[PDB]
């Protein structure tokens, strides 16, 4: 397309040196027998044929292959983008090439869907070039489709067999690596032969463990959206007259905000798991943020950054008590909102709610009071809510104009505040990857053929020792039932891989609480650049903050 | 920062001319200048300064009107623009090797700085740390506008004070509006102390035969260029999101324009253009469905628009509201002195007339206030605030409505899941390019020399832009050529002219000839982030608009 397109086509994505010998002359050396977290009793009823399955690393020396024929490979991309999708497909093309100039890969369309739809292309050689490190998962778009009915698995199963599959690699998060576990005890107890591999994807960095350092996409994004941080404070530095306020893509973490965070030193930066931690309420939340502002103000500086993650709001206890009390005055008195008109029916809730939610309640802005009443009006069948109707970073500033508008007039506040709000997500999860996920990504796609042609299912493709060069990190895989879980849902009990959420005991987070009270009244801003694809080492392959500290 | 340590290393690269002993650059004079239009009256103001010669440097002699050390002033205005540091470097540099014995003086937060005599040395380190990085923020920038008796008074007794011979104002077309006037205040009172402007701004609305582009333009049209592109290959992954991207570029469309040839987007809207059509806001609305839904009946439900931020000024029914409200504020302040927006907007309704009235009020609620609030934050220059008004929103809710017209009719089958983004504040202050880390060094260098060479009121000038900087030619345009009279506040003054897309030009004639094709189709273009070491070609990468403009 562009000239960066056609020249960062031409990288060559640095292997682990062990993936770069022989196939012949890479040997397996077998772990312990794993277990699950917790109910490891009934992962072994559910997953009877997989479970125990030892950690595999990989080793130089001769070894004998479970193949000799040619491979045929189908490969399936679910969820929202992760830069770097397409070069775990290059490097799984690359490698099974490699193996046998005869082997095929075939590409299944909008997820999983594709493959019970038989909906696919063949990946050929000319094809895979023209997507050769690039962003996006547009090679075979993505969606999300689970596959759960007995009629579904076999229709998988079917769309496999028709199509001469010895292996499918699912390219995703927590759920469908948790589905692609059950795909492959389902052909496991059925007696098929057909290998299922899942490969680690989020640019959230929700999936994690002591075995893998950190999903694919979470590099490349955290650095767009530092370098949009790192250039909004260094205009609000510029002018000296605007606080932004910048929302972070995601609900369920606060990793990329922390990440942002130790980039570009903002003023403010706020971390969920800490809010849900020490139980904050939305006016101590409130009266912290104008806390940082006033001060500043007294020091001159009519400025500054605040840095939010979109899942904030639902990790305010407090907010989802008022919603679990509003919807009780709702599930009761039935027929007394007839026929309401809303505004009216506010008053209700008004009057019947307790004396401390009716001042929660109140103190939000009006627009809000409104769109709380709309998201009970829709639960689903099971009768719960969620709060998406509230965008976090407006509630905030509305509520901090109303606080020092009521400061102004009682003469505590000289300065003036000007918030300009921003939401990042779209542009960075379709990016072109950093080298770091460009390596990562194109040898987790490389290594999982490995997997496969030693006769492995049920693995999650893993690469480790991220933090030093590429030709020193370590290649394996890791069992997916030892991650899993159960999670009780509606009176059942299915397998379940648990998001990984901010560590408050880890070394990132404990760096950012022991700086932050500095960077709140300090202008100590740091300037990340846009990602370098050419020039010295270390800046092309930086990795993470969280990363570096994390490992080390 | 590991980045910003290893550019700060980066080596600017000036025309050759200019790597000459100040001893062996000669000027030479050549065509005499007129202003725009209203050349009448304009020369009546500019009674000193009007039609001067355009200025070049060759290998030579010349007459140096200096033998001691220099002392000047420096003025960063405006907004930010990435490169304002590489000017000032250059001249710092300039100086120094001119006579080490002189001094560079930032005036801290624009004009006012002067007027105030608020200001720091700056000296070599503090220089050394701001070499090749964005922002404003080694004097920081401000928006006032220097007219009175007593303002000059004050900016001349504190220009004396300070025993400046020179004082180099960077900034659009506001601050070169000011630069302008004080060159022909110090010259008409008498004074020896020379005034230089330097062409600043990210809207590149500060053009001419001469000036073929404004800095800073060619760094943040990449980086919002980077982030549409992303938007756009997003939206191709999966195949559902209708993006609206506002962009800065306050009334032209030349931010706009370059971003859509950079990307192909599947609409981008030419406010020119609509001026031009005299389009209603409803016919712009419908253009845009028209091209949704037929993306739709080809199986297509996303997409990308990009939306200029001045658009309401060049809708005629829109501008005409915008007018009216700004003349009934304007003759009945005091009524408004103390009101909220609610008791506002019914004084504004109760005061218009009845075509006026009838278009404000079929326009949604949050827009109805947003102009209101576009008026009262005018700038001391008297722009409208535009960047505020969020008009990627009003396009968003009206297309919802008229999609869900068709719906009603069994004639739109589609969802349409609106996305909207305003690309603005996050490019001014970005890391400059190549071509503006070498534009902005020579430009602030070249200054110096006019300055070496006696002259006042020149615009620093360095010209063809697209070649290698050492084959770029150095010198100086009169800032009169560019003014025109204009009604601001009420009343009528002499301003730059804003430089606005040319429709005969040939940026909008290669989006013309391809739009329909990328309407339709999805032929989207992915520019990754701005190179900054590497090989030549991709590092010093310029703008669509340079390269079609001097072919
Ligand atoms: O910085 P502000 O006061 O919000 O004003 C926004 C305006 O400044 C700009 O970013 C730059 O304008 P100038 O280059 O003319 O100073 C415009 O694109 C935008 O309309």
Known sequence: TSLFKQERQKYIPKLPNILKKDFNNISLVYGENTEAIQDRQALKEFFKNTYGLPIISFTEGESSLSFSKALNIGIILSGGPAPGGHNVISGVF???????????????????????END??????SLINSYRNTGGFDIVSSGRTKIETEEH??????????????????????????????????????????????????????????????????????????????????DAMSTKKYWHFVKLMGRSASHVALECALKTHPNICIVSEEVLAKKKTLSEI????????????????????????????????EVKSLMLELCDIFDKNEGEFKGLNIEKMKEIFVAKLSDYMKGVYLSLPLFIQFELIKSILERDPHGNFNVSRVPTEKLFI?????????????????????????????????????????????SLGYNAVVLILNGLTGYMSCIKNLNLKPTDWIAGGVPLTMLMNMEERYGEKKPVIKKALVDLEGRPFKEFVKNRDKWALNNLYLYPGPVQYFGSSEIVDEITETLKLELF
Do not use: W
């Not at 075995?211 to 370098?227: L, Q, R, V």
């Not at 912290?288 to 939010?308: A, Q, T």
């Open 94 to 116: 690359d490698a099974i090439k490699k193996f046998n100039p005869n082997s095929k890969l075939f590409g299944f369309k909008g997820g999983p869907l594709g493959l019970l």
């Open 120 to 125: 696919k292309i063949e990946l050929t050689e």
């Open 153 to 234: 698995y076999n229709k998988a199963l079917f769309v496999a067999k028709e199509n001469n599959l010895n292996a499918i690699i699912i390219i995703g998060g927590d759920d469908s690596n948790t589905n692609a576990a059950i795909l492959a005890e389902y052909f496991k107890k059925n007696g098929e032969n057909i290998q299922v591999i899942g490969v680690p994807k989020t640019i959230d960095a929700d999936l994690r463990n002591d075995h893998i350092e950190i999903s694919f996409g979470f590099d490349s994004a955290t650095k767009i959206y530092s370098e949009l941080i790192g250039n909004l404070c260094r």
């Open 286 to 317: 409130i009266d912290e943020m104008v806390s940082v502002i006033l001060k500043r103000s007294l020091n001159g500086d009519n400025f500054g950054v605040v840095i939010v993650p979109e899942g904030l709001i639902e990790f305010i206890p």
């Open 398 to 442: 509305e509520m901090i104009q109303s606080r020092l508008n009521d400061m102004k007039k009682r003469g505590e506040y000289k300065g003036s505040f000007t918030p300009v709000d921003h939401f990042f997500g779209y542009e960075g999860r379709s990016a072109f990857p950093s080298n770091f996920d460009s390596d990562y990504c194109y």
